[PDB]
Amino acid sequence: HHHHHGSMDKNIIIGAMTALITPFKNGKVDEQSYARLIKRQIENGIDAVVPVGTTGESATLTNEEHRTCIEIAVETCKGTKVKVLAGAGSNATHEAVGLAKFAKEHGADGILSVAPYYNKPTQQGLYEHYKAIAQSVDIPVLLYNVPGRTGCEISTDTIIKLFRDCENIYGVKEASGNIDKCVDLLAHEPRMMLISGEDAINYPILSNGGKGVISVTSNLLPDMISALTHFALDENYKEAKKINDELYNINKILFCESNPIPIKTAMYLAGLIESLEFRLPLCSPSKENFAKIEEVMKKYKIKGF
Amino acid sequence: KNIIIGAMTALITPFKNGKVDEQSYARLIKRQIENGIDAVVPVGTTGESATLTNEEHRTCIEIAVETCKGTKVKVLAGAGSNATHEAVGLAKFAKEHGADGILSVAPYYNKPTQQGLYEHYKAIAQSVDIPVLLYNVPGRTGCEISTDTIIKLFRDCENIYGVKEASGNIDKCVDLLAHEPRMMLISGEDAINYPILSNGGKGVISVTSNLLPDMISALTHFALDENYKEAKKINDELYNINKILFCESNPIPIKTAMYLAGLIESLEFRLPLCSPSKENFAKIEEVMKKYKIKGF
Amino acid sequence: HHHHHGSMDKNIIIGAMTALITPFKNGKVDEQSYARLIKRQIENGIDAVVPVGTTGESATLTNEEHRTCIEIAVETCKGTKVKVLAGAGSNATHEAVGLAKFAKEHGADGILSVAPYYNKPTQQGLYEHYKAIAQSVDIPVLLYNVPGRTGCEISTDTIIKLFRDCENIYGVKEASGNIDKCVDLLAHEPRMMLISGEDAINYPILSNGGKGVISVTSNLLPDMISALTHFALDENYKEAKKINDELYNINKILFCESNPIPIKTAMYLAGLIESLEFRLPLCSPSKENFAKIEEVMKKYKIKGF
Amino acid sequence: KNIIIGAMTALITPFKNGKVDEQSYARLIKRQIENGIDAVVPVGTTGESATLTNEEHRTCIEIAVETCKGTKVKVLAGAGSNATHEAVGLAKFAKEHGADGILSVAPYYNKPTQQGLYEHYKAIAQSVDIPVLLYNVPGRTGCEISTDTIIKLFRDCENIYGVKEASGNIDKCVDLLAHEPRMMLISGEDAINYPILSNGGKGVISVTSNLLPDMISALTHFALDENYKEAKKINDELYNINKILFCESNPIPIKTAMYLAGLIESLEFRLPLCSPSKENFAKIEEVMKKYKIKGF
Ligand SMILES: NCCCC[C@@](N)(CC[C@](N)(CCCCN)C(=O)O)C(=O)O
Ligand SMILES: NCCCC[C@@](N)(CC[C@](N)(CCCCN)C(=O)O)C(=O)O
């Protein structure tokens, strides 16, 4: 137990990553359309898939359904280059550690663990929470900071102190709308993998040292997000910003309403899923926003299966 | 409509070596009964509902039911969740085991729309035949239940009868009670207990009640008897402890206060909750020296 | 110079008070409609008038026009019970002290001085700013806290420490949407006059010890606001809340857009002023909000001249 | 369109016994010229425009004009106001006295609507024939200039050519430059200087430039020559001073820094601005020990 973990060997999960929607069909999860949807991601240059995130409706899934979609994501990318960074966060520490051990023993390449929501833990509670998770598994741990949906914020000091104190934790996914914090993170701890959780600012984050994205827009346009990320990591910022500017219109209309309501609306209107099913308290969008998503979608080339 | 109002307590959940100490829970509730409390709210956010298991959540509702059997005190069990099928299961859980009503927090983390909140609460209301009190706490859920959403649920379902506002928005409480005066507005913010009940509010769901149940009971009962002079004097006299109980995220400071008053054995939280800094630990006991803490 | 000023003799300006709109006619100020508009306030039970506030467009008036409307407000209430609490705040201390000395030497009964805007002074700068103003005049000083429009907040400690340290400062006008701060102020310093700057919460503030309001809705319905305030100060809270609940609909539609754009729209549609003139960067409201204000207005009885 | 871009400095206004010390102002600007600065912005928010008189505002624009005559450095005079007739008078003020352009802050205190901002800036643009750069700082004005409002002003008036964003909203800077790529996006936030110019920004209006003009000039010129590796290294190396210069409201910390570097005689502000606490006074000098401060 030491504080000098930053430059030791860390396994990382970077590149273009996708927060997978969870398709539903007559109350259950469409396990077969789930497999089809990920194969589409594999064939479009995607580097990793994130099952059961916020886009996958982690709140409304049961413990037994959460398990099925981690196993399916692992098995469709077996034999391929694509990695599985499974969502295993929870607002209870015993729940987040219990999910982390499942993902490790079932083939996941890493885990995404969101900051505890609703109960608003303190900075010492956050250290304690993630330290228990990191010492529970031997696979990489990527923090997820989304203060607008959890009520909590992982301090830059906590993120940097966990990076140095834990040997699995190697970075964070920032959904903060705070580019200042992204300069703060990479100017004081440049050995960390800063990941974008906001599609509109995918490129500005990657131009300051970011090493990957966990996209929601990826669900609809995996090829374009794949090109944007790989252009930036190849230090080809002119072409990476060219893609980023052309994606802004769809990057924001996919959040006209709370994620993942608009993105599943796009996939229904693009024929990529049969039915427009959400699980309450999520519901189909307003009739005005339904028309707004379909209008902006006509300006992009949607790849099929 | 059947309603549950008055001075109510968001019960802390005492722990002893990692497990729920069921015997101190009953003891702590008996202290609430004997100090003028009108109802108890088991396993809310103050009760650490997030870190409890599904099987521990049930036992603490059953313990509350049996400790108030034969008394005037009602049991308003916490049954909220960010998944509607989970909240409907817990609402049906409380009904079959003797609870008089349920408190249901707005879904957290997933940020439902106004239409999602409507269908979320309607599904809960269609699961039970006992009153349902909404709970709006935007600072911890990321979403807010519109005044119109609250009013439209109040009129469409016969169990939904009010809301427990923890918003710091006195403007919203005039909006609610000027357009729907039959509604029971309950305070979820101890510092503004009097101003809310001062505009037509009919009860509180207190965190301070845990430590000073007699004073919070007096504040509420004075206001509903329209003795606002005496109800406001207690509110002004409680402001110092009402704010130091949130120096850190609830329920970290109040569980510290009850440990320093000998009312619980151990200062255990369940992660990601933890004991406070010793600087805030010293501040809470200093504020406690100015108040009269009722014992057992 | 001492810290024990709280219980010494303080002159106060309380009751129902009105932030007067400044009518314009072909670029100039309508000095004659200004006099007419205040006489309407006098004849409807109003206790005091606030010339050249935020509702009077203090930002766009010149120094010479600011002067004229303080003199006119003083002279139309000469011989009457109505008091003049002139607006004399500014983001520069030499400007706020210069205006305070004018109001004193020209017949004002007190001054309203807003917290400095734009330059965001610190709490020590705020003490310093108001202490210089208070020691410049011998007439009462009422602070004005509106953090949503200045970028600054007067700490409860600063307001209480200025109340005790200054012999003219006797209270504050809170436009904060923070009822917690109104419990904070009156629970630690009950000898202060807490004034409401938010019409929707006029009664809840008066029920916790508030002693008056500085209303914008007063411009249209002075009689109803006059009844609400005097009912509360006579401890008749049932009838004061009865008025407050019936005023909520107009209390909020008068802020569909930034004050004082909606309130002058109401007075144009009620025939109380000839022309709908603002001074840039203020402008007439959107055509949709113009219809919204007129629709809600039909449910109230508008007293004429 | 004529544009004013590059590394720019929001000039502090030094005072000496209550009056503007006009001789140190010229001296401080000469230091800016000789350290690679492209333009100077007199009497902004960093220059204490609020507490200056109308006659002092003019002299500090004229001093800036004469100190950069014969040099490559341009003068982008501050001419914003919350009243449009005042801002048009100041815009016409700068034009008749040799300024190359004007910086115009969004109206403060009175919170104009999006239509009000449009007519506010159009009136300023129709008063002068030199470029006009908008200034959006929502944390100090209470209002925000919509991306569409900025784009609609850019296309309708031939002097308006960009905006200086002090918003901490990198999302808005993608919105602006993806829908209007001919626009000159200028940074008004020193900490995010590189990420903004990294997305197509073409200059900065710095507060840190006052103390370290050579480093800020190098950061900007590296980025526009597309050497983002070297431009980002300077940005990461400046973060510590970029944040301690806002421990208190600007320009209180930076005026403290220049006093501790001997570059100004007296640490005078004009009320309601005042010297910082000695705790923050000690913190600013500690951060200064890690940077190389260019002298005269
Ligand atoms: N995907 C696996 C199921 C978890 C779903 C859950 N609703 C559970 C959150 C929970 N901690 C459940 C514990 C219930 C005990 N009261 C909660 O806060 O309700 C969430 O994480 O949001
Ligand atoms: N009602 C009397 C005229 C004041 C109008 C003024 N725009 C002036 C604010 C001011 N301090 C004026 C000083 C101008 C010197 N640069 C400002 O910030 O512009 C305001 O107070 O908002």
Can you name the residues that pair with B185 across neighbouring β-strands?
Answer: B163
CA A81-A85-A89 angle, 5° bins: 175
The 10 Å Cβ neighbour count of residue A172 is 27
CA distance D90 to C7: 48
Distance CA A139, CA A120 (A): 26
Ligand closest to Cα of B80 equals: 1
Residue among C175, C115, C166 at smallest CA distance from C141? C166
Half-sphere exposure of D19 (CA within 13 A, CB side): 5
| Intra-chain end-to-end CA distance of chain D, in Å | 35
E strands present in D28-92: 39-41, 74-78
**What lines the ligand 2 site, CB under 6 Å?**
C 58-59, 61, 63, 66, 90-92, 95; D 49-50, 52, 54, 57, 81-83, 86, 109
For residue B119, the chain A residues in CB contact (below 8 A) are 280-281, 283
Q: DSSP 3-state assignment of D133?
A: strand
Residue A163's alpha-carbon distances to A128, A143, D239, in angstroms, are 13, 10, 20
The residues near C92 (Cβ < 8 Å, ≥ 6 apart) are C116, D50, D51, D270, D271, D272
- Which of D135, D161, D194, D259 is the catalytic position? D135
| C-beta atoms of C180 and B200 within 8 A | no
Give residues with Cβ within 8 angstroms of D138, minimum separation 6: D106, D144, D167
Phi first, then psi, for residue B165 (nearest 5°) are -85, 115
Q: How many CA atoms lie within 13 A of A88 on its CB side?
A: 32
What determination technique applies here? Answer: X-ray
For residue D197, give Cα distances in angstroms to B53, D7, D224: 50, 11, 8
**DSSP state, residue D112:** -
Residues across chain A: 305
**Distance in angstroms between the alpha carbons of the first and the last residue of chain C:** 48
Strand ranges in A109-244 using DSSP code E only, listed in sequence order: 110-114, 141-145, 169-174, 193-196, 212-215
CB count in 10 Å sphere of residue A81 = 11
A117 phi and psi angles, rounded to 5 deg: -100, 160
The pair phi, psi for residue A225, each rounded to 5°, is -70, -35
Cα torsion for B150, B152, B153, B154, to the nearest 10°?
80
B145 is in an annotated binding site: no
Q: In one letter, which amino acid is A174?
A: E
* CB contact A282 to B (< 8 Å): yes
* Radius of gyration, CA atoms only, chain A: 18
User: Which residues of chain B make contact with C198, given a CB cutoff of 8 A?
Assistant: 171
From the candidates C10, C83, C104, C173, give the one annotated as an active-site residue.
Answer: C173
Residue B134 token pair: 């909404």
By most ligand atoms within 8 Å of CB, the mutation choice from B48, B81, B109, B111 for ligand 1 is: B81
Cα–Cα distance for residue pair D181/D167, rounded to 1 Å: 19
| Residues B42, B20: Cα–Cα separation, whole Å | 13
- Whether residue B168 lies within 8 A of chain C, CB to CB, comes out as yes
Task: Give the list of residues 6+ apart from residue B147 with CB closer than 8 angstroms, or none.
Answer: B172, B175, B176, B179
Q: Which residues contact D149 (CB under 8 A, 6 or more apart)?
A: D114, D117, D118
Phi-psi category of residue D65: left, alpha or beta, with phi > 0 → left and psi -120 to 50 → alpha:
alpha
Max CA pair span of chain D: 50
Question: Using the 8-state DSSP alphabet, how is residue C117 labeled?
Answer: P
Say if residues D245 and D254 touch (Cβ distance below 8 Å).
yes
Q: After which residues is chain D broken (C to N over 2.5 A)?
A: none
Q: Which atom of ligand 2 is nearest to the CA of D109?
A: 22
Burial class (CB in 10 A: 0-12, 13-18, 19+), B6: buried
Catalytic residues of B, by residue number, are 135, 164
- Cβ–Cβ gap A177/D171 under 8 Å: yes
CB contact at 8 A, B257 and A109: no
Cα–Cα distance list, B117 to A261, B63, B133 (Å): 14, 30, 14
The one-character DSSP state at A117 is P
DSSP letter for D109, please.
S
- Structural domains in chain C? 15-298 (3.20.20.70)
Contact B211, B261 (CB under 8 A): yes
Q: How far is B72 from chain A (nearest CA, A)?
A: 31
**Is the omega angle on the peptide bond into residue C281 within 30 degrees of 0, that is, cis?**
yes
Contact pairs from chain C to chain D, CB under 8 Å:
130
Say whether residue D171 is in contact with chain A using an 8 A CB cutoff: yes
Count CA atoms closer than 13 A to C41's CA, side-chain side: 33
Percent of chain D that is helix, strand, coil (3-state, to 5): 45, 15, 40
* Residue C212 to residue C17: CA distance in whole angstroms: 7
Residues D114/D103, Cβ–Cβ less than 8 Å: no
Locate C251 and state its tokens: 């209390």
Residue nearest to atom 18 of ligand 2 (CA): D50
Transcribe chain B into DSSP letters. Answer: -----EEEEE----EETTEE-HHHHHHHHHHHHTTT--EEE-SSTTTTTTTS-HHHHHHHHHHHHHHTTTSS-EEEEE---SSHHHHHHHHHHHHTTT-SEEEEEPPPSS---HHHHHHHHHHHHTT-SS-EEEEE-HHHHS----HHHHHHHHHH-SSEEEEEE-SS-HHHHHHHHHH-TTSEEEE--GGGHHHHHTTT--EEEESGGGT-HHHHHHHHHHHHTT-HHHHHHHHHHHHHHHHHTTSSSTTHHHHHHHHHTTSSS-----TT--PPPHHHHHHHHHHHTTS-----
3-class SS of residue A217: helix
Q: Are C175 and C145 in contact (CB under 8 A)?
A: yes
The values of phi and psi at residue C133, to 5°, are -70, -45
Contact B171 C241 (CB under 8 A): no
- Residue D161 falls in the annotated catalytic set: no
C93/D123 touch (CB, cutoff 8 Å), yes or no: no
Residue linked to tokens 């509730």: B29
Return the best residue to mutate from C91, C112, C149, C150 for the ligand 2 pocket (most ligand atoms within 8 A of CB): C91
CA-nearest of C9, C10, C3 to C131 is: C3
Distance CA C175, CA C214 (A): 10
For B24, residues 6+ apart whose C-beta sits below 8 A from its C-beta are B14, B16, B264, B265
**Peptide bond preceding D253: is omega within 30 degrees of 0, i.e. cis?**
no
d(CA C222, CA C42): 9
Report the pocket of ligand 1 as residue ranges, CB < 6 Å: A 58-59, 61, 63, 66, 90-92, 95; B 49-50, 52, 54, 57, 81-83, 86, 109
Q: Do chains D and C touch (3 or more CB pairs under 8 A)?
A: yes
Q: Do C241 and B169 touch (CB under 8 A)?
A: no
Strands (DSSP E) found in chain A: 15-19, 24-25, 28-29, 48-50, 83-87, 110-114, 141-145, 169-174, 193-196, 212-215
Collapsing DSSP to helix, strand or coil, C139 comes out as: coil
* SS3 label, residue C133: helix
Question: In sequence order, which residues have a C-beta less than 8 Å from that of residue B163 and are 6 or more positions away?
Answer: B133, B134, B135, B136, B145, B150, B176, B183, B185, B186
